[PDB]
């Protein structure tokens, strides 16, 4: 769980770049997922390309007991609660007829438990289907076809994808009869009517006051299994844009929020939303120093092949997340009326494995 901390840290820095390029647009993203796929990529890279990835990420995949820690981490996040509620996948695709380095395919399999996929990219259509069917089969058909694979052509040599789906039942369900339509106050001051769920309960809560004096509501919603939680953060005042918060956001801060919470009764009103985002990882990664890997005759992929040059043609994350009411002796009812928190303005959410600290999901909702 030294790995869980560094991955989330790297993953949240990537989210930050994605948010800064999509102001006033919804985004859902996976810090764990981008960290996971880049770990795999480290093993195919060498020289200055490998150093660029390792300096951003804060660790090397070759180091003793690091690939086994990722595998242990994987199973702790997914073993908990399965079914069609959570779903994840990483894959690298390389041109089929390249001579690969001796012993690489077996070596990759020992560390990660899967192959580097080999496909004939000159069979353009075939290769599009193979890459879309990989995502489709492995996410139980919950995510729509990748857009970015339209760039895939005869000259394409290397492609990496990551895809996740999440739809959790809560620890305590939202009572359904309190679900209705309410005005949501967009960042440009206009409103839209949207369905919002409502629940009275004891919640883990804290205020967060940034250094300029604007204060925020930080609220925790545990999922069933008592293992994962969704964190909700929103400035109180509508005048404070959410970029003030995403620009100073880190994996560590989210832990400080948690570490300083208390159980208090509230009546929470939260939008019912669904969100799907395809993210092209090129520019976010470039901004964190990983420039060489995308560039012809700069990229050093000599660990995967020393017969021919390679470079990443396309690097994509696609995530989809659902947020609804569903959940799963002596419960005593409120005598007094609880204080209210209404999330009817753009807000941040984080999904967090509390034991490890892993940030599974992160996003901004500018219009639910």
């Amino acid at each position, epitope marked *: 769980s030294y790995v869980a901390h560094l991955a989330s840290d790297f993953g949240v820095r990537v989210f930050q770049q994605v948010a800064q390029a999509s102001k006033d647009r919804n985004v859902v993203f996976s810090p764990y997922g981008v960290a996971s796929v880049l770990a795999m990529l480290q093993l195919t890279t060498g020289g200055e390309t490998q150093q660029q990835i390792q300096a951003a990420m804060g660790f090397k995949i070759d180091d003793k007991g690091m690939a086994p820690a990722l595998r242990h981490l994987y199973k702790e996040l997914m073993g908990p609660w399965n079914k069609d509620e959570i779903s994840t996948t990483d894959a690298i695709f390389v041109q089929r007829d390249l001579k690969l380095v001796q012993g690489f395919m077996p070596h990759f399999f020992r560390l990660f438990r899967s192959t580097v996929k080999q496909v004939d990219f000159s069979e353009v259509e075939r290769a599009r289907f193979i890459i879309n069917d990989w995502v489709k089969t492995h996410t139980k058909g919950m995510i729509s076809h990748l857009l970015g694979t339209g760039a895939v052509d005869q000259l394409t040599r290397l492609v990496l994808v990551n895809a996740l789906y999440f739809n959790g039942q809560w620890k305590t369900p939202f009572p359904d009869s309190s679900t209705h339509r309410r005005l949501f106050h967009k960042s440009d001051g206009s409103t839209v009517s949207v369905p919002m769920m409502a629940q009275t309960n004891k919640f883990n809560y804290t205020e967060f006051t940034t*250094p300029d*004096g604007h204060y925020y509501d930080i609220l925790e919603l545990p999922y069933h299994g008592d293992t994962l939680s969704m964190f909700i953060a929103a400035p109180y005042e509508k005048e404070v844009p959410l970029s003030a918060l995403t620009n100073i956001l880190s994996a560590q801060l989210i832990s400080h929020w948690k570490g300083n919470m208390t159980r208090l009764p509230r009546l929470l009103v939260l939008p019912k939303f669904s969100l799907e985002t395809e993210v092209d990882l090129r520019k976010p990664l470039e901004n964190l120093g990983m420039t060489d890997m995308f560039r012809p005759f700069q990229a050093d992929f000599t660990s995967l092949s020393d017969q021919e040059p390679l470079h990443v043609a396309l690097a994509l994350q696609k995530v989809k997340i659902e947020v609804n009411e569903s959940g799963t002796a002596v419960i005593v009812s409120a005598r007094m009326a609880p204080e209210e928190i209404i999330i009817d303005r753009p807000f941040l959410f984080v999904v967090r494995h509390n034991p490890t600290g892993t940030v599974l999901f992160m996003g901004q909702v500018m219009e639910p």
Partner: nanobody, 115 residues
């Protein structure tokens, strides 16, 4: 009831250090941002340092240049400013302020003199 009492200031030599401190009472310290400002005759009041209530998120005035460090102790309701590599131009009255908008509070200041 509300009180912000600064201390730690004084006369020092160019290149010397100081540690400012402000004792706070009469309001929910742990939910307020804490800040330091400075002012001398003729000048406006200017932001030197600021910190969040939790998570150690900070903010400094352009003139600080990594020389001053702001910290806080929520259990002891106190805020601090460690000042290093002091020069004549830092001579001013230093004020602590507590803010959770729209509410603000001010102390009475402590004099820092350098030469």
């Amino acid at each position: 009831q509300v009180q912000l009492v600064e201390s730690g200031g004084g006369l020092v030599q160019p290149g010397g250090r100081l540690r400012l401190s402000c004792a706070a009472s009469g309001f929910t310290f742990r939910t307020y941002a804490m800040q330091w400002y400075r002012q001398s005759p003729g000048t406006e009041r200017e932001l030197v340092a600021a910190i969040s209530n939790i998570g150690g998120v900070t903010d400094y005035g352009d003139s600080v240049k990594g020389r001053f460090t702001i910290s806080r102790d929520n259990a002891k309701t106190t805020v601090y400013l460690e000042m290093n590599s002091l020069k004549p131009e830092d001579t001013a009255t230093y004020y602590c302020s507590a803010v959770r908008l729209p509410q603000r509070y001010w102390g009475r200041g402590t004099q820092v003199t350098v030469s």
